[PDB]
């Protein structure tokens, strides 16, 4: 199936003294592989997946240089944006950046992206064509003009279509044993009685990878959304994911309801019953 590499960056200004708190994380699909935290002792980009430890000193030096350069851009931006938005030096503010590339089943470039937010709101993003920018307001418009004049988009497009894809393919090969493996959900169903007349059925999916999954209920073979509760997919903490969906039913009628599980680790959709 398709694959992605994505980087996420957050800086949070610290008004009273010193530089912003800066945190960078890198993912391939749903697996974190690197981190940098400005509060940590090492002041290096750090491995977070065993397959990235294959990379030598030059990689780690280069990624450290680049991530610190990222941190400094964010520091400058926080000051610029405070000015653009006529804000005081009293408050804490946040910049967030996300960029990366998607590839299809053939591992060829599909999509690239680069977006930026200030205080949790869209500021500026590269359009799908990787040639122009979406600016949310007049502040971002000024940035857009700056970036157009300096041909920023051209440099980013080269990275997103080239380097990003090249290194993603490299990571997928080095981490093949886990990165190219699917873990099918382990499914079961639980029952709870709320009263003499009402029952809760809960359909569980555990230990699955990647995170994308669909869980639905049917009643007598037709989709049932009413009286259901579906939790957000959550990390187990060991690299796999969990999810559940529950339905409230009349006591004695449990037989009418079936849970249906779709996941890339399952060739056929799975069905469960009480």
């Amino acid at each position: 199936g398709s694959h992605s590499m994505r980087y996420f960056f957050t800086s949070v200004s610290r008004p009273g003294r010193g530089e912003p708190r800066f945190i960078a994380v890198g993912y391939v699909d749903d697996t974190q592989f690197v981190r940098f935290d400005s509060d940590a002792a090492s002041q290096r980009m750090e491995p977070r997946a065993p397959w990235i430890e294959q990379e030598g000193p030059e990689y780690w030096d280069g990624e450290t240089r680049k991530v610190k350069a990222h941190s400094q851009t964010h520091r400058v931006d926080l000051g610029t944006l405070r000015g653009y938005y006529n804000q005081s030096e009293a408050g804490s503010h946040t910049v967030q950046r996300m960029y990366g590339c998607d590839v299809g089943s053939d591992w060829r470039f599909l999509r690239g992206y680069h977006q930026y937010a200030y205080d949790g709101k869209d500021y500026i993003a590269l359009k799908e064509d990787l040639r122009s920018w979406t600016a949310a307001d007049m502040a971002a418009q000024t940035t857009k003009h700056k970036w157009e004049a300096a041909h920023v988009a051209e440099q980013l497009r080269a990275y997103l279509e080239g380097t990003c894809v090249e290194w993603l393919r490299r990571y997928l090969e080095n981490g093949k044993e886990t990165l190219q493996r699917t873990d099918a959900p382990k499914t079961h169903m639980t029952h709870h009685a709320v009263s003499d007349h009402e029952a809760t059925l809960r359909c569980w999916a555990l230990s699955f990878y990647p995170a994308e999954i669909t869980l639905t209920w049917q009643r007598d073979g037709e989709d049932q959304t009413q009286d259901t509760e579906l939790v957000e997919t959550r990390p187990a903490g060991d690299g796999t994911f969990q999810k559940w969906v529950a339905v409230v039913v009349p006591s004695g009628q449990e037989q009418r309801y079936t849970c249906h599980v779709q996941h890339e680790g399952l060739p056929k959709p799975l069905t469960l019953r009480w």
Binding site: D77, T80, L81, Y99, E166
Partner: peptide, 9 residues
């Protein structure tokens, strides 16, 4: 592998 350059706003 991180982007080589990040432009400021």
């Amino acid at each position: 592998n991180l982007v080589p350059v990040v432009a400021t706003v």
